[PDB]
Design a protein around this ligand. Structure first.
Ligand SMILES: O=c1ccn([C@@H]2O[C@H](COP(=O)(O)OP(=O)(O)O)[C@@H](O)[C@H]2O)c(=O)[nH]1
Ligand SMILES: O=c1ccn([C@@H]2O[C@H](COP(=O)(O)OP(=O)(O)O)[C@@H](O)[C@H]2O)c(=O)[nH]1
Ligand SMILES: O=c1ccn([C@@H]2O[C@H](COP(=O)(O)OP(=O)(O)O)[C@@H](O)[C@H]2O)c(=O)[nH]1
Ligand SMILES: O=c1ccn([C@@H]2O[C@H](COP(=O)(O)OP(=O)(O)O)[C@@H](O)[C@H]2O)c(=O)[nH]1
Ligand SMILES: [Mg+2]
Ligand SMILES: [Mg+2]
Ligand SMILES: [Mg+2]
Ligand SMILES: [Mg+2]
Lengths: 299, 296, 288, 307
């Protein structure tokens, strides 16, 4: 039989203290990936595990040519450990999976089908009010991806999308709004069996309007400027009408003293985002690699 | 029968939902470019259209070696879609053209002729007291050619030399080249003959903030000297006229007001710093037809 | 017998006016490094010395193949000259020491042993007395340490490598350990505050939320609680005016403190001027 | 004879409306450079001239293999036009001179001599003993604490714009945007081997550049004022927390004498905080801006950058 040096699919699994599930995960994944008759690879990212998960990963690495390990220097975030695996993931399609396996792995057979039709990004949302009517008109046409009962963390992305978001710091939080900005051909498939809180979803909306727009800063600059010209001109005219004494002296100082703190709020928020954009510090660090080559030190 | 590999002219056309005008656009442009006896290319930028404009593009691409398609991932806007096409245009001269042919394509013959005389940028300009005031404020900085400003003139129909495209290639302001960047790059400029001042002076403020630090510096010193006049007014005059409310409110209103536009000029420049340091690209290319991906 | 191309250990010594200690430093260093039977190199960084330190360095350079000199243009400081020496230092392990030998060179034999076991970073912290790791208050871990090649490469482009003991050692992770050896509380939390602002961004966000929610309590109380109760035509006026201008006028200064603090760090991150400048090199090549 | 391929000296001249002085400039410079018996080059930067200076430069370029022209797209500052010429200048030493010839060119023989002695930067400051006053002694005593023994290169009646710089110095500051104001403080930060040569042939801007220096090479104005503004904030918050927690009473203490002063003091310290914050924010924009420092329209006898 012949050989093929091109990888078509890459599954990335971040692991933190997953000593138990390695045998069942690899057996289930093999029973799902083998019938496809397509070359693949398994990127296992050890995220500073303490329960000897790495020792078991290396054992599966020795007896499986598809197992590749990315050992981080310490425990990072789950999203950061996922970004590290995607960086070391070669292949035309990338799909992340969880270790606890809340979603059936057999569903990848349906995701790759939509990818073969031409779709660059294919989500896997489960099937299960005024907010949904809102985001459909502004945020994204496919609001069912980020509905309360399911997050679009189970998805397939083409190589063009992974390459497009390689340098973006928002690739860590790709489901926070970056998916609606990158565009491309998107679709989803349906299936059945913390998060899910509406406070945590409007938190993603607030985190989205500040990250992909300058409106909160610009509309407050113009608003603060027009109330400033009203303040200075009315003070010059008041110093040459009605002088309500305390009914204005307290109102004015406590109004201006309060509006400056929220102005300093949006300034401090955007200043923190500008800092996070200019840091030379990477998202993660790789301690060891098994079955992979290091990324170029240019970065 | 000499095969020339160098592209002499580049026509860049951003298109969003121009399914109807494709037949007349490519045909009427051909009768203008053929008598020039000059190698050229047409860079057609698909800006996320839904009305199957891309399918009609690919059909024209299949039977025309000068048609090259740049398929964007989504709708990004006219200025960004134009910037994407200029990036993939490797010709000695670049000319952006609208698909609805608001300007006659025959002016290309006039644009290239003035370009061969040595001019690096050649424009194509059409022909109350606000018209006398606005035109007078701009000749002090714009220079010899200001007619590209005065309404309804827009310089979006122009010819730019390769040196000019390369000079503004990495600048984020290349999307709004007609917002002030044309007057900063300088070069040898000229034009050929053939609104809303609320938006015209909007670009004046957007230019003073983009190419200068004067509003921030001037207000920094202006707010600093009134801070010294402040602290000194309560430094020596506390060891001991007191209009009471006539100044307690005014000072509260005055000192609180000069800070609000101090945070305004700071908040404006801070947003510009974000737009300069953000890692998010200007656009994303979904597919390419007849072109290679960048960087080459 | 046979030549060896790869250097295994690198000793980095920042030097400022060390004309006298050179004879004893190089002799005692050779006494410690020779029994290791391991190829090494000594990177000597001249940090703008005013005495005859450089002349003695060149003399030792001429008769010793392991002495290499990095001459800085001017005096940049102990930390910057240390970063400059690590940049021009190749080898699997890097160990910085001082010219005045409060750091006994014999501990290198123990530092390399812990590194042989798999530890990527091995500290040489002094014993405390008085009254993992976390020895950063009593005498505390200093610039006496061993770092694997993977660790020095990971923080090569980071500006925080100058102050690696200010918090970067806790962020990089890796396998870490320390070794104890013998022979102010204000700087403790001065460096602790210097760490919570560089690797966290929480002091800015927490004060952003706090300053904004007290702005809502402020604005809501004066906009239409006072206007709604005096539209019919109060709390002690002077006491309320005084407590309002000083509470609001002072909390804004803390917001300006954290904003100015982070703005200065953004300037230090985007400035194009380098950290140091090399005037001459002896036994080394220029970078990049 | 034989041919040498390395350039030993580079003379950079920014030119703006120098049509008349070109004939006297190139001839007098050639009479100074020939006896040195070392290879050299003359980089002429056309800085958006409005007359026929460029046409005359091209004529000198056609008959002189040492004349090279850098034509900028438009008129920039003299600092920018000089930085553009240094970028296209290849050579072991670089010397910038003015076109109107305000300083004698014969000093090059002394600059190269000091350069061959080992000095990386050699200045040529004028010798003026006039204007000795107490203010000059104050400025000299305050600037000597940071600049060093070489600080004499900036008395009020002279600057250090006539200098020789080694290739290592021009390379060290090639990517720095502050190279246009190299004589505004950057010369003292590079710290290379420096000396000057003497020859005899406003205080507003001096301390203005010093104020620009403490902001350009330091963070003290921002750090000191944030610390100061914070400790007076602690005094303001605490003292007001006890003025509201003093329930042992119920109209005013000092009424207008203190309260009007209070809004004034807290309102003024914030304006200085906004002053230093806005000042450093503008410098951050100048460091992160993608807009280049200059643009080159044409080149004669040179290659475009990068190589
Ligand atoms: O610090 C962490 C935490 C999480 N994980 C990985 O992320 C998944 C988190 O699973 P969990 O059920 O807690 O999150 P959820 O299923 O709700 O998305 C696990 O498979 C871990 O392998 C990780 O690598 N590092
Ligand atoms: O979102 C858009 C809108 C405009 N266009 C193109 O930009 C040009 C603008 O022409 P239009 O007549 O629509 O605008 P106007 O003439 O008013 O300037 C047209 O060729 C469009 O194809 C585009 O690429 N994306
Ligand atoms: O400005 C300086 C001061 C320190 N050093 C070097 O750093 C080490 C620290 O020595 P020092 O005794 O001054 O530091 P301390 O003992 O107080 O920790 C010495 O080898 C010096 O040569 C230096 O290169 N430049
Ligand atoms: O806008 C300018 C002004 C100055 N110069 C050049 O800089 C030098 C300084 O000229 P000027 O005599 O006007 O300045 P000053 O002699 O007073 O220092 C001259 O050789 C000019 O060619 C320039 O290139 N562009
Ligand atoms: Mg789980
Ligand atoms: Mg139109
Ligand atoms: Mg010491
Ligand atoms: Mg002059």
């Amino acid at each position: 039989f012949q050989s093929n040096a091109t990888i078509e699919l890459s599954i990335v699994i971040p692991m933190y203290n997953e000593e138990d599930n390695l045998e069942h995960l690899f057996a289930r994944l093999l029973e799902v990936l083998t019938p496809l008759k397509i070359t693949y690879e398994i990127i296992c990212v050890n995220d500073g595990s303490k329960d000897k998960t790495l020792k078991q990963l290396i054992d599966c690495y020795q007896s499986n040519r598809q197992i590749k390990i990315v050992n981080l220097s310490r425990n990072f975030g789950k999203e950061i450990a996922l970004s590290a695996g995607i960086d070391y993931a070669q292949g035309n399609a990338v799909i992340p999976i969880d270790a606890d396996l809340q979603d059936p792995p057999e569903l990848i057979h349906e995701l790759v089908d939509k990818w073969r039709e031409g779709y660059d990004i294919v989500y896997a949302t489960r099937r299960s009010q005024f907010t949904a009517k809102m985001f459909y008109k502004v945020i994204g046409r496919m609001t069912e991806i980020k509905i309360p009962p399911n997050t679009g963390d189970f998805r397939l992305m083409d190589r063009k999308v992974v390459n497009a978001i390689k340098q973006l710091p928002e690739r860590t939080r790709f489901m926070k709004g970056l998916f609606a900005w990158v565009g491309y051909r998107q679709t989803f498939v349906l299936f059945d069996r913390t998060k899910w809180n509406y406070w945590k979803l409007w938190n993603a909306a607030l985190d989205g309007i500040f990250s992909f727009s300058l409106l909160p800063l610009k509309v407050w600059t113009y608003l603060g400027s027009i109330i400033s010209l009203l303040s200075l001109a009315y003070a010059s005219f008041l110093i040459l009408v009605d002088v309500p004494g305390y009914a204005s002296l307290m109102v004015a100082i406590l109004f201006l003293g309060g509006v400056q703190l929220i102005s300093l709020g949006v300034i401090g928020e955007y200043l923190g985002r500008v800092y996070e954009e200019v840091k030379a510090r990477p998202l993660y660090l790789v301690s060891d690699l098994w079955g992979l080559e290091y990324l170029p030190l240019e970065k």
